[PDB]
Amino acid sequence: KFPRVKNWEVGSITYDTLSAQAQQDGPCTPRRCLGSLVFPEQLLSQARDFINQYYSSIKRSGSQAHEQRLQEVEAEVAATGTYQLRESELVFGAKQAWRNAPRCVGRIQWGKLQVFDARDCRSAQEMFTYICNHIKYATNRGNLRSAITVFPQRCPGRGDFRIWNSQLVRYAGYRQQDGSVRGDPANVEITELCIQHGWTPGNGRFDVLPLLLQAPDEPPELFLLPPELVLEVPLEHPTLEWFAALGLRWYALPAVSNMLLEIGGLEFPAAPFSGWYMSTEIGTRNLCDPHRYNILEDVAVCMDLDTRTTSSLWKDKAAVEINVAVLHSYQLAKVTIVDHHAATASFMKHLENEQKARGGCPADWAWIVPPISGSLTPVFHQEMVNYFLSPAFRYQPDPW
Amino acid sequence: KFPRVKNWEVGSITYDTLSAQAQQDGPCTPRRCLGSLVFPEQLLSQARDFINQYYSSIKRSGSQAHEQRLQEVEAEVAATGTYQLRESELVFGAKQAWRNAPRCVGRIQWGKLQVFDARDCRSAQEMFTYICNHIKYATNRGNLRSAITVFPQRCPGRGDFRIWNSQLVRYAGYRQQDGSVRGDPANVEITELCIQHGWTPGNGRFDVLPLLLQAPDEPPELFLLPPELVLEVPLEHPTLEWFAALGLRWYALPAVSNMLLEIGGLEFPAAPFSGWYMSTEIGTRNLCDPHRYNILEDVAVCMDLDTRTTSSLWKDKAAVEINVAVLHSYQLAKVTIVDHHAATASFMKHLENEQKARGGCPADWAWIVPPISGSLTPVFHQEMVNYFLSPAFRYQPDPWK
Ligand code: HEM
Ligand code: HEM
Ligand SMILES: O=[N+]([O-])c1cccc2cn[nH]c12
Ligand SMILES: O=[N+]([O-])c1cccc2cn[nH]c12
Ligand SMILES: [Zn+2]
């Protein structure tokens, strides 16, 4: 009926009544759980539900304006096979999509999202202008502001606007001869696509990639981000003097650009969004994942730890100092950053706010709990319920 | 139809075909996932399936022996509502239950399990003797050996044998008149139950609780484990000289005693089992959980860390050193223990073995990934499929509730 969830640190229980409202199917069945896996009339039912959500949000549900809107969309769909959202609806929908993202621990900030309407975009060049503007606004010289820029919706019998890059700012990954990768291993494919489309590659570990922007029915076009718009942070450790010499750095702006935004049945294949970094994403995942920069052993060796035996907990010790270096460096550079303890505590507050506001909150435990020191944070001890609500952000296949 | 699971570190992909054989329903539905939540004709089909499993295991499927077995089990259930397992079947069944435990990261060891048959136990006193013998064998002076002791099965006509304690060795949790708890806060209820039943309590932080054992339809009885049978390890740190002054310690043997063992439709409400500790369970959960010993702040302060701000990562640093103290202490005392890196690496080998052997393996990601340094272990990057197979270890309601 209603999932009963317990917080094991306090013993409190709540019921996630919002889950009974889940609009789409997940991959689990009563026979087996797949929670750990990373990956016309229908349009109308989704559109109506969304319009209903919008009017409820402004406390005008059941009004003649609400009825008029419903009829307006039904008419548009009959006449064109699709419909258009009003600016206020787009803004509400984009905020709801963030609010609804089960894997995001930074949702306490959902209501403060700044939504840029780029549905008037006509070309790859105009896209670029929007992207540079988003980066300038969002970065704000270190005092980051959450934002999303929404490009034109998917339309039948017309290609999509697409940003080939996974994030607005990413480091190149160069296949070396010996099979190794110089730079970020996660970006080998996009790096090679950029080279193929005319980019002259660098040869460093932290070379900022160019953007491959695609306008409807046009091949992707290459654009170089002005270095003055890309704020970066050189990494140093507060006590380990040699850390700075490793030459490690990371960018200030985490801007996912390959996800699809769905609002009332409409799809926006290009709608880059950005907030600010939770330190573990950089320190633990980006820098320490075995398939990423994999710097753990290199750092442990510099700290002079016994890397001969697992029981010395050399990996754990190195990891903690790498995260300390990240936090210390961003704070020194005056660039917004949140540590995993502060972030998880704010998420517990978000859960409480949502229990009061909607009677629940879709949350994916495996993604909410940080990659290091999980049980040292409050979210680890909190049972969660994962489900799909729309508006939403969804994964989509790469354009190539 | 078959779940595709990927390892993100290697890139490799496998399909869990074993999952299609899931024997019972979990809590998830297509609408919502609840994986993070901690908690006659029927008998016949489960019994026949178990017998089929046993015969396949000894490569005699379809033999006359297999056929007679099925008929005998059917005859017994038809006449009595239950049946008698053979000794070899009980042994096979106990190992499969461990093998099938989704939340256990130590399953690489599933085939090496000593099974003590106690199905003819007739009293709480005899149950105590069986338990003392189990603890003795399992502890083996520090060279721990996996074991399980199986008490009489549940059956029509009488109540069940039950062990009230959650583990054979646990520390008392005393409510202080001030609302705080001395000892282990997780054990306040069982501690109070022991006192209610006749136990005059101690007043320490690490007082081994007496066993509260119950024979069918009788009030539980109290028994105190001879101290010489309970091996403990005093905690010290290899470089932090003051750590030893905290007076911390932990027991050598992790022996879960409140789960029900299910084999071929038969249920064994009392069947305590034990292996050896994965260091984080002691260092991170038992000592650092806010609702447990909660020693993080005391340690960070003695380490002279800045506990006024979360961004100094004082919590993380202290936890790492507490785990270091646990590993160092057990290694020094010559008591078996395994760190989370070694344990997760072995479980990755287990997954590989099971893929070849059964075409899959039920695994609960949230429990397999250690409480600290999750992404630093290989299991974090391995997608998993969670499902129920029988024989199995299941949770059951407390005997007083
Ligand atoms: C304000 C600061 C923010 C923080 C600290 C934050 C943090 C996070 C973290 C830690 C994850 C999990 C990534 C991982 O470790 O695997 C995540 C995922 C996600 N976040 Fe947030 N986030 C923020 C803002 C935003 C904004 C502005 C949006 C959109 C408007 C958003 C949308 C999402 C989505 C859709 C995911 C899932 C991505 C995926 O599954 O690949 N986040 N976020
Ligand atoms: C050989 C050493 C062993 C190690 C290192 C090991 C380790 C673990 C760990 C770390 C957990 C998770 C505990 C938690 O999340 O709090 C677990 C759970 C479990 N283990 Fe093992 N284990 C071992 C042996 C055994 C044996 C001998 C059995 C049974 C015959 C067993 C049965 C189980 C079961 C049923 C669970 C689930 C417990 C629950 O859900 O509360 N384990 N084990
Ligand atoms: O870890 N993060 O901070 C993070 C991860 C994924 C998306 C976004 C957007 N802002 N911050 C994010
Ligand atoms: O953490 N552990 O080592 C652990 C947890 C739960 C049950 C058993 C049995 N042996 N070791 C166990
Ligand atoms: Zn699930």
Residues 6+ positions from A197 with CB-CB distance below 8 Å: A212, A220, A222
- Cα A347 to Cα A368: distance, rounded to the nearest angstrom: 9
Q: Do A107 and A223 have their domain in common?
A: no
Q: Do A131 and A170 have their domain in common?
A: yes
CATH of residue A303's domain is 3.90.1230.10
- Please choose, from the candidates A64, A63, A85, the residue with its C-alpha nearest in 3D space to the C-alpha of residue A73: A85
Helix (H) or strand (E) holding B51: helix B41-57
Q: How far apart are the first and last CA of chain B?
A: 41
Q: Do A298 and A213 have their domain in common?
A: no
Q: Do B167 and B218 have their domain in common?
A: yes
Q: Do A300 and A197 have their domain in common?
A: no
B374 located within any domain: no
Instruction: List CB contacts (< 8 A) between B320 and chain A.
Output: 313, 316-317, 320
Helix (H) or strand (E) holding B175: strand B173-175
Q: Which stretches of B50-139 are assigned E, i.e. beta strand?
A: 114-117
Q: Do A208 and A133 have their domain in common?
A: yes
Q: Indicate if B276 belongs to the active site.
A: yes
Whether B339 lines ligand 4, by a CB cut-off of 6 Å, is: no
A329 located within any domain: yes
Q: Do B291 and B311 have their domain in common?
A: yes
Residues 6+ positions from A126 with CB-CB distance below 8 Å: none
B31 located within any domain: yes
Q: Do B55 and B67 have their domain in common?
A: yes
Atom 3 (ligand 3) nearest CA:
A277
Cα B151 to chain center, whole Å? 17
Instruction: Residue B41: count other Cβ atoms within 10 Å of its Cβ.
Output: 7
CATH of residue A45's domain is 3.90.340.10
Q: Tell me the sheet residues that pair with A115.
A: A148
Whether A254 lines ligand 3, by a CB cut-off of 6 Å, is: yes
A138 located within any domain: yes
SS3 A208: strand
DSSP 8-state secondary structure symbol assigned to residue A30? S
- Cα A341 to Cα B320: distance, rounded to the nearest angstrom: 16
Q: Is B292 left (phi over 0), alpha (psi -120 to 50) or beta?
A: beta
B65 touches chain A (CB under 8 A): no
Instruction: List CB contacts (< 8 A) between B366 and chain A.
Output: 365-366
B165 located within any domain: yes
Question: Is the Cβ–Cβ distance between A329 and A269 less than 8 Å?
Answer: no
Residue by residue, what is the 3-state secondary structure of B297-357? HHHHHHCCCCCCCHHHCHHHHHHHHHHHHHHHHHHHHCCCCECHHHHHHHHHHHHHHHHHH
Deposited experimental method: X-ray
Are the Cβ atoms of A365 and B35 closer than 8 angstroms?
yes
Angle made by CA atoms B195, B200, B201, in degrees to the nearest 5: 80
Distance B279 CA to ligand 4 centre (A): 10
Residues 6+ positions from B185 with CB-CB distance below 8 Å: B173, B291, B292
Q: Do B188 and B236 have their domain in common?
A: no
Sequence letter at residue B83: Y
What domain range includes position B178?
120-145+160-231+395-399
Instruction: Residue A388: count other Cβ atoms within 10 Å of its Cβ.
Output: 17
Q: What is the resolution of this structure in A?
A: 2.0
B387 located within any domain: no
Residues around ligand 5, an ion, CB closer than 5 A? A 28, 33, 35; B 28, 33, 35
Count up the domains in chain A and report the number: 3
Distance B259 CA to ligand 4 centre (A): 13
Are the Cβ atoms of B375 and A371 closer than 8 angstroms?
yes
Residue from the list B296, B320, B387 with its beta carbon closest to the beta carbon of A32: B387
Chain breaks in chain B (C to N over 2.5 A) after: 39
Q: Tell me the sheet residues that pair with A4.
A: A15
Instruction: List CB contacts (< 8 A) between A23 and chain B.
Output: none
Q: Do B73 and B190 have their domain in common?
A: no
Q: Do B73 and B222 have their domain in common?
A: no
Question: Is the Cβ–Cβ distance between B31 and A26 less than 8 Å?
Answer: yes
Q: Kindly report whether the peptide bond that precedes residue A216 is cis, defined as omega within 30 degrees of 0.
A: no
Angle made by CA atoms B290, B295, B299, in degrees to the nearest 5: 140
A9 located within any domain: no
Residues 6+ positions from A123 with CB-CB distance below 8 Å: A215
A4 located within any domain: no
Q: Do A68 and A199 have their domain in common?
A: no
CATH of residue A169's domain is 3.90.440.10
